[PDB]
Amino acid sequence: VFAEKWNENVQYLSEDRSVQEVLQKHFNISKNLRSLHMLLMLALNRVTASHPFMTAVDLMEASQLCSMDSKANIVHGLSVLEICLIIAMKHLNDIYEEEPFNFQMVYNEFQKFVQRKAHSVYNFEKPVVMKAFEHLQQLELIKPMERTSGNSQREYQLMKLLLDNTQIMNALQKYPNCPTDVRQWATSSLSWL
Amino acid sequence: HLNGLLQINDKIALKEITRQLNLENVVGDKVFGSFAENLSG
Amino acid sequence: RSRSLAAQEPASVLEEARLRLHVSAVPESLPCREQEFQDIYNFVESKLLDHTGGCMYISGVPGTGKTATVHEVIRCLQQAAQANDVPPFQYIEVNGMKLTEPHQVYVQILQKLTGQKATANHAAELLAKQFCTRGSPQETTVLLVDELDLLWTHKQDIMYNLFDWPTHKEARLVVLAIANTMDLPERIMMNRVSSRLGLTRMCFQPYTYSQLQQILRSRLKHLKAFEDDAIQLVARKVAALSGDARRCLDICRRATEICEFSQQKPDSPGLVTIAHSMEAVDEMFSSSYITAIKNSSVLEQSFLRAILAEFRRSGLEEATFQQIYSQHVALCRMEGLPYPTMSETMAVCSHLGSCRLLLVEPSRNDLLLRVRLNVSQDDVLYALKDE
Amino acid sequence: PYVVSLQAKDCPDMKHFLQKLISQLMDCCVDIKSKEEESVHVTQKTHYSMDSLSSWYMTVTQKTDPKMLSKKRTTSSQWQSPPVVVILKDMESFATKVLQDFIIISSQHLHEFPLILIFGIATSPIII
Amino acid sequence: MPHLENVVLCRESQVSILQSLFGERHHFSFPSIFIYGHTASGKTYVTQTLLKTLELPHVFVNCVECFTLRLLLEQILNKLNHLSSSEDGCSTEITCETFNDFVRLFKQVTTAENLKDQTVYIVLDKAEYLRDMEANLLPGFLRLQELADRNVTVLFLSEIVWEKFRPNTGCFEPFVLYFPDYSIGNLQKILSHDHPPEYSADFYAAYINILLGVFYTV
């Protein structure tokens, strides 16, 4: 008796405005049978001791978690130091058309944003800059041209970026707690001192 | 049952081939000699 | 009768043709070569009666009869030795690929003659002092070596010392150096190897058009199952490719298998039709590129289309991965799909990277991926507009 | 009483670096005329990793004293339990990549391997 | 309970995911589960507690302590014979170095009644230094289910993202799980749970809020 309702419930979900959209999305990316294996076992994990039948809800949530932008969600769990760094090299890429640059150039603009601001406690010191940039080394967000010098110190790096000029702008409205004096600096092309 | 993903050279493949037939040895593997007469009316 | 299926006797005609066409079930060798078999016959015969030693180096692609014509040279000399005509000889065989290290050749030689086995040094020293032994008779042995490029070392102490052995007093070694092209002694090998050898290199030319139709006729002397129009058609394509003796009978075996697919009908045809000869060419030389774009999806065909669009206004076949992502959204939005995410960019690349249809370094520089098309840029345009 | 001494001119690599640490723990123990005596040793290989120093520290606290360990590791050698203390007198010239591999192993294995580090900076601890 | 949920109060959507993949002893799973996080400490502390609670056969090895493939495959068997059966195997060592013999000797150990129809977990700590050696040990764990034919689930706790260790000829595509980031509303409660007995609850939590607003930006 339970075997007849199993094959019949799939037919009711095969013709649906939301189920057919998930099938055609994965078929265009990879039509291989292996790409569909993860779309059938993830929905079975949700079915526990309180799911007598199936629906179009347990199959849509299992296809989104395996297709999100894995290169844009890693910036949500950060502070403000490393967030301002990845935007600093983004502004330098617009004026330096494809050419390497070291880290000491980022320090030149660090003391430039401190102006046009009232005297408060937001100002830092100096060793915090190298500590905030080193956190991106273990995350593999920068890549050398071809050689990593062994005798290189905290001035000679000639690193670049491993992102793009598209997902960096769309990851600002979804970031939790965005200051007003920081978001305006990222959208503009640095027109003030 | 062979798999090319495990084997990376050629000297190792001459010894692991006897682990599936087991027609002249035991759990032990015979001399290191590279196979020369692989049995071939 | 020990085995349950001890070779079922072919009661039909198509099942019997495979016995006379098999590369192993050969009654003799490949004919249509009497001007070359007689030349090497008088050469080996003059060495046994003289009790001396010489060298021999032929040439040709691996598929002109170097493994079948050399067997008849031994089968004819063994018959005269039993009738008190030629002195007896010893049968020695050794291949160049059966040994991993190129210095282990001294083990197969000592084991074939006697029974003592040592190594590449313990044995290699006993064979040097045995050939120069004064006061010991030997026999007119034959040395058959194959694939000489694998025995090449840095010191060149494998091919040089091998040719100096039969150039002594009591030395009856007949070296049959088998290789590929003839310019090897003047390319890979240096001066010492080519000097002590000689200019006795008679190459073997591939079979002609009139010779391929005769060898296949000898195998099908009493096999009434193939028309005369299909035999000359199969031997015609192989004769224009390279004249290989192995690329002719393999196509005929495919003709014996495509005809059995139509024998499932109640009717039992006799000779082959004209459709079996046309299908024996496309299936023999199949293409692994025209079927990749036809059986593709939607995102796969759109990703390869933007590659040619960027290699038109630039003139360079090398680009980056950040530039190809910009124009990829333009072709995806026009047809009616949202913008592609960044995480799936390596997913669609791993599919084409697994089959290695796009030469690119592994996941080390995601934004500096070198695009290298495995095929040309004009053949992908004709195979795309067919849909 | 166990003192391990090493510097930068020894072995600046991965395999030979840990090899010198094995001989240091064996020389500082045979200098006490207690139960052990002369025993010629030939290093010819005995594979080792992180359990070679952990198993040796557990066996040395059992055969030396005639059953004197209390409960939950305390009062091993009369007073307190002897820790594994090393000195780094010449570490600024040593390879920085090797100094970041031997510290991340004893972090999670500290409950069964008391390690004590002594730094000897010849300038200022700011460069650390 | 004391160290599975009280450490991070933002795992309510991850407990039902790992427990669903476990099931029973005779239940299987993917041969490789890649889970990358941040700080390389949040996903490690929760692993040592969740596995020590349900009492399941599991080991812990590291790829940074050993730079050769001979020592990596040796430490796995050293921590397996002690729990392979109900009794010890007389403390016997294993002498091997060939990578092809690893799948042969592992089947003989997983033959007893303790590891016959049970799920074996292989946690690879710090899985971001495997690209320094050879490019052949990466797809070995992705296709271990087909070769070994045993209920073995290899876990990964690396800092690098998944789309960085792609081989030249491709490999199996498993499931990429991403733990949620440290929320601002949940980090305040986990830093005040470990209160000393010298104070209380409301009196001690007030000294944490005054330090979170000044240390969140740094």
Side-chain angles (χ1 to χ4, degrees):
Chain A
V1 182
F2 296 153
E4 300 180 0
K5 60 180 60 60
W6 179 266
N7 300 330
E8 186 68 22
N9 188 25
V10 183
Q11 184 67 21
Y12 295 154
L13 300 180
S14 56
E15 286 74 16
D16 185 69
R17 60 180 181 270
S18 60
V19 182
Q20 296 181 356
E21 189 271 347
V22 185
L23 300 180
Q24 58 88 15
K25 202 273 298 180
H26 298 73
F27 179 80
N28 303 333
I29 300 179
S30 300
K31 60 182 300 180
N32 186 22
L33 299 180
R34 177 169 294 183
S35 60
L36 197 60
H37 292 168
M38 295 70 65
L39 279 308
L40 275 67
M41 54 86 58
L42 289 177
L44 186 59
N45 299 126
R46 185 62 59 90
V47 180
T48 60
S50 301
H51 298 69
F53 299 91
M54 307 299 180
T55 180
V57 184
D58 300 330
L59 42 79
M60 48 79 60
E61 53 85 20
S63 60
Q64 298 180 359
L65 41 78
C66 60
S67 59
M68 291 294 100
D69 198 333
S70 58
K71 300 297 298 300
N73 62 331
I74 60 180
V75 301
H76 297 68
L78 298 179
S79 301
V80 192
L81 297 178
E82 56 276 355
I83 292 297
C84 187
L85 294 179
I86 60 180
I87 308 179
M89 285 84 70
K90 180 60 62 181
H91 298 174
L92 300 181
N93 188 26
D94 301 330
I95 53 179
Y96 295 102
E97 289 75 14
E98 190 67 24
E99 46 185 336
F101 57 93
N102 44 18
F103 173 73
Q104 51 84 17
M105 299 183 62
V106 187
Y107 184 81
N108 297 122
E109 56 85 24
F110 184 81
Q111 281 69 16
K112 186 180 180 300
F113 190 77
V114 195
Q115 283 71 12
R116 66 126 186 176
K117 183 180 179 300
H119 179 268
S120 300
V121 299
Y122 189 80
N123 184 23
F124 307 95
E125 191 187 11
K126 181 179 180 60
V128 194
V129 184
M130 286 68 68
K131 287 300 181 180
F133 182 81
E134 205 275 339
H135 183 268
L136 292 320
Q137 179 67 21
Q138 60 180 0
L139 301 180
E140 285 76 27
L141 263 61
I142 57 180
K143 187 64 181 180
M145 271 266 109
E146 54 242 5
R147 303 181 182 273
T148 136
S149 146
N151 49 16
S152 61
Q153 301 294 338
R154 299 278 75 90
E155 190 271 348
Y156 180 84
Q157 294 84 195
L158 43 79
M159 305 299 182
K160 291 179 60 180
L161 292 316
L162 296 181
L163 289 315
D164 57 79
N165 50 16
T166 299
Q167 62 181 0
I168 182 60
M169 300 181 61
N170 297 122
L172 300 179
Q173 66 282 354
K174 58 178 59 60
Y175 182 77
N177 301 120
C178 295
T180 60
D181 53 354
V182 183
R183 184 179 180 180
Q184 299 180 179
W185 179 85
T187 60
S188 61
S189 300
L190 188 59
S191 60
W192 53 82
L193 300 182
Chain B
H1 298 69
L2 296 179
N3 182 25
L5 187 59
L6 303 179
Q7 181 68 211
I8 59 180
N9 300 328
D10 61 330
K11 184 61 179 180
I12 297 94
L14 299 179
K15 269 65 182 179
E16 53 85 20
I17 183 60
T18 60
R19 297 299 301 179
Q20 300 292 341
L21 285 314
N22 300 90
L23 79 166
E24 50 83 22
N25 49 14
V26 283
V27 247
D29 242 353
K30 26 91 54 97
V31 78
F32 48 84
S34 137
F35 217 10
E37 182 69 21
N38 50 16
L39 190 61
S40 59
Chain C
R1 182 179 180 269
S2 60
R3 187 170 63 259
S4 61
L5 21 72
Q8 188 271 348
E9 301 292 337
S12 179
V13 184
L14 300 180
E15 301 179 0
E16 190 180 0
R18 294 182 176 90
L19 191 146
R20 301 298 299 270
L21 199 60
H22 192 201
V23 298
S24 300
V26 180
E28 33 180 0
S29 62
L30 300 180
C32 300
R33 191 179 300 270
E34 52 86 19
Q35 67 283 352
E36 301 292 337
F37 181 80
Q38 186 67 21
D39 191 10
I40 61 179
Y41 176 80
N42 300 120
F43 177 79
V44 64
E45 183 180 3
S46 60
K47 302 300 296 180
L48 271 63
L49 300 179
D50 201 11
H51 303 272
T52 57
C55 300
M56 183 62 177
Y57 179 85
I58 62 177
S59 180
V61 297
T64 58
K66 57 181 57 58
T67 63
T69 59
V70 300
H71 296 353
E72 298 292 337
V73 188
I74 308 179
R75 298 284 80 90
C76 63
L77 296 180
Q78 61 179 181
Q79 300 291 151
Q82 300 180 359
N84 300 120
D85 300 329
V86 298
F89 57 93
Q90 187 69 209
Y91 182 80
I92 302 97
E93 69 286 353
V94 51
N95 199 333
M97 41 71 54
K98 294 297 183 300
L99 303 176
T100 57
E101 287 75 14
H103 300 273
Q104 299 180 358
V105 71
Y106 301 93
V107 183
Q108 301 293 339
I109 299 180
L110 183 60
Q111 189 271 348
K112 184 64 59 57
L113 299 180
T114 59
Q116 319 106 9
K117 3 244 181 329
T119 175
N121 296 109
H122 304 345
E125 56 181 0
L126 270 302
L127 299 180
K129 59 178 59 60
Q130 196 273 344
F131 295 153
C132 61
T133 300
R134 309 303 179 181
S136 299
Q138 295 81 6
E139 298 182 1
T140 60
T141 59
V142 46
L143 300 180
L144 178 60
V145 294
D146 301 327
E147 199 70 19
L148 299 179
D149 55 355
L150 297 183
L151 288 315
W152 178 86
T153 60
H154 182 268
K155 300 301 180 180
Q156 287 77 214
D157 60 330
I158 301 300
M159 298 68 60
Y160 176 77
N161 49 16
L162 189 144
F163 295 154
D164 300 330
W165 293 345
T167 60
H168 296 172
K169 298 296 298 180
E170 299 178 355
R172 302 177 181 179
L173 301 179
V174 184
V175 181
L176 277 304
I178 308 301
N180 303 119
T181 167
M182 67 178 183
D183 55 354
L184 293 180
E186 48 271 20
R187 282 281 78 92
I188 161 180
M189 279 71 69
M190 46 84 65
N191 181 267
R192 296 183 178 181
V193 185
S194 302
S195 57
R196 280 76 182 271
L197 180 59
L199 300 180
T200 164
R201 292 86 60 89
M202 293 65 61
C203 176
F204 293 158
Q205 301 294 149
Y207 300 91
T208 75
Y209 179 81
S210 60
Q211 296 179 2
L212 294 179
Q213 60 180 1
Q214 183 68 209
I215 299 180
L216 273 61
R217 184 180 181 90
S218 60
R219 300 180 180 270
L220 303 179
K221 188 178 184 300
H222 297 273
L223 285 312
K224 284 79 180 180
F226 303 93
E227 60 180 0
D228 299 0
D229 299 330
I231 299 300
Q232 53 85 18
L233 197 151
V234 179
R236 180 177 300 271
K237 182 60 180 60
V238 61
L241 181 59
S242 60
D244 196 315
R246 273 70 181 180
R247 300 299 300 271
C248 64
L249 81 170
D250 292 340
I251 307 181
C252 300
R253 180 174 297 274
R254 183 55 181 176
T256 61
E257 300 180 0
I258 187 62
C259 63
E260 295 182 358
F261 295 156
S262 180
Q263 297 293 150
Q264 303 293 338
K265 302 179 181 60
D267 190 9
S268 60
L271 300 179
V272 299
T273 180
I274 59 180
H276 298 171
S277 60
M278 300 181 300
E279 299 180 0
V281 182
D282 300 330
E283 299 180 358
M284 185 62 177
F285 300 92
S286 180
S287 178
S288 60
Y289 308 98
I290 59 179
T291 60
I293 188 60
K294 298 299 181 300
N295 303 333
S296 60
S297 59
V298 180
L299 185 60
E300 300 180 1
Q301 54 86 17
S302 61
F303 181 81
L304 301 180
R305 182 179 300 180
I307 302 180
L308 183 59
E310 297 182 355
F311 292 159
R312 181 255 301 180
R313 77 282 187 272
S314 60
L316 186 63
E317 299 292 338
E318 286 72 15
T320 62
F321 188 78
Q322 190 271 348
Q323 299 180 0
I324 195 180
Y325 185 81
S326 180
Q327 281 70 15
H328 182 269
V329 190
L331 281 310
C332 184
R333 186 181 58 89
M334 178 58 60
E335 44 91 1
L337 282 181
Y339 62 96
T341 59
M342 184 57 59
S343 60
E344 65 91 23
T345 58
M346 296 63 61
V348 297
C349 182
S350 60
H351 187 193
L352 282 311
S354 180
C355 54
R356 207 172 60 180
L357 263 59
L358 180 62
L359 301 181
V360 62
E361 59 276 3
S363 56
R364 300 305 302 178
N365 304 330
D366 50 355
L367 272 302
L368 289 315
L369 291 176
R370 301 288 85 90
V371 42
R372 294 296 182 90
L373 288 314
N374 187 26
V375 297
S376 300
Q377 67 282 352
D378 54 354
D379 53 354
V380 299
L381 189 143
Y382 181 82
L384 183 59
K385 301 300 180 180
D386 298 331
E387 300 181 0
Chain D
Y2 306 94
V3 179
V4 177
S5 301
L6 70 158
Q7 49 185 340
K9 73 108 180 180
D10 301 330
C11 300
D13 58 329
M14 302 300 181
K15 299 300 180 300
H16 298 70
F17 178 79
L18 193 57
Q19 177 67 21
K20 295 299 181 180
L21 299 181
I22 301 300
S23 180
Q24 293 292 150
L25 273 304
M26 298 300 180
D27 296 332
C28 62
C29 182
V30 300
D31 296 356
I32 300 180
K33 185 59 179 179
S34 58
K35 62 178 182 61
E36 65 279 354
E37 53 181 0
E38 63 281 350
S39 155
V40 30
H41 154 72
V42 43
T43 176
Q44 293 177 335
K45 218 289 300 180
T46 69
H47 299 70
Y48 53 91
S49 60
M50 66 171 180
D51 60 330
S52 59
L53 289 316
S54 300
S55 60
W56 181 88
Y57 182 82
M58 189 272 300
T59 57
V60 73
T61 59
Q62 299 180 0
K63 59 178 179 299
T64 300
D65 55 330
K67 189 61 63 180
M68 209 258 298
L69 302 180
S70 300
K71 300 179 180 300
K72 304 302 295 297
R73 186 187 300 268
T74 177
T75 68
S76 180
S77 63
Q78 284 74 26
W79 296 352
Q80 68 280 338
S81 180
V84 181
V85 51
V86 300
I87 57 180
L88 290 315
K89 53 180 180 300
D90 293 354
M91 70 175 186
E92 58 279 354
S93 61
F94 197 78
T96 60
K97 278 74 60 180
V98 187
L99 299 179
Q100 303 178 9
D101 296 332
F102 81 104
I103 181 59
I104 60 181
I105 304 302
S106 60
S107 300
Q108 68 283 353
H109 200 271
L110 187 62
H111 56 281
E112 294 292 338
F113 202 177
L115 180 60
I116 301 300
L117 302 179
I118 294 183
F119 290 162
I121 299 95
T123 307
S124 295
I126 306 300
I127 326 179
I128 302 300
Chain E
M1 300 300 300
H3 301 272
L4 190 146
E5 190 68 22
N6 300 19
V7 47
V8 174
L9 295 179
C10 199
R11 307 304 180 184
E12 290 76 12
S13 60
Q14 298 294 337
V15 178
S16 60
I17 301 300
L18 276 306
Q19 293 182 355
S20 60
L21 299 178
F22 297 155
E24 300 291 338
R25 279 75 60 180
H26 54 78
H27 291 179
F28 300 90
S29 60
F30 286 159
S32 299
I33 298 298
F34 185 85
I35 299 178
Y36 68 100
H38 295 68
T39 69
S41 60
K43 58 181 179 300
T44 305
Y45 183 82
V46 69
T47 306
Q48 302 290 344
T49 306
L50 189 144
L51 297 182
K52 264 64 179 181
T53 302
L54 301 180
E55 300 180 0
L56 301 179
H58 59 272
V59 298
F60 287 94
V61 297
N62 184 21
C63 300
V64 192
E65 50 178 332
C66 304
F67 301 94
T68 58
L69 40 77
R70 185 259 182 270
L71 300 180
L72 293 179
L73 302 181
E74 178 66 25
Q75 299 179 359
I76 302 179
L77 279 308
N78 296 330
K79 301 180 180 60
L80 185 60
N81 290 93
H82 295 66
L83 299 180
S84 61
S85 301
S86 301
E87 60 181 0
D88 300 0
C90 300
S91 300
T92 56
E93 301 292 337
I94 301 300
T95 301
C96 180
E97 52 85 19
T98 302
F99 186 81
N100 301 24
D101 298 332
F102 180 79
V103 300
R104 179 181 59 89
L105 300 181
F106 184 82
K107 184 179 299 300
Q108 188 271 348
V109 182
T110 61
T111 312
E113 68 284 348
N114 296 88
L115 282 75
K116 181 179 299 180
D117 197 3
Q118 292 76 11
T119 301
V120 181
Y121 303 92
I122 302 300
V123 181
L124 299 183
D125 300 329
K126 301 301 180 301
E128 64 279 352
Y129 294 94
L130 281 73
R131 78 281 182 270
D132 206 336
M133 305 177 182
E134 61 179 0
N136 302 122
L137 45 82
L138 290 317
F141 298 92
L142 275 304
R143 300 302 300 179
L144 192 144
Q145 185 70 20
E146 182 69 21
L147 301 180
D149 198 4
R150 297 298 180 180
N151 195 335
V152 179
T153 300
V154 179
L155 288 314
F156 296 90
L157 297 179
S158 61
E159 188 71 18
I160 188 57
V161 81
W162 169 255
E163 51 272 11
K164 290 297 298 180
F165 290 158
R166 301 298 180 89
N168 300 270
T169 60
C171 62
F172 179 81
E173 181 68 23
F175 177 77
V176 180
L177 182 58
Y178 177 80
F179 290 158
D181 300 330
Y182 298 152
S183 179
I184 177 180
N186 300 326
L187 189 143
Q188 187 271 348
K189 300 180 299 180
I190 60 180
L191 267 301
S192 180
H193 181 268
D194 300 330
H195 53 72
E198 301 178 358
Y199 300 93
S200 61
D202 299 332
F203 189 83
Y204 178 79
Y207 296 159
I208 274 74
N209 308 334
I210 61 180
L211 300 180
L212 181 60
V214 300
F215 294 155
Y216 182 80
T217 178
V218 302

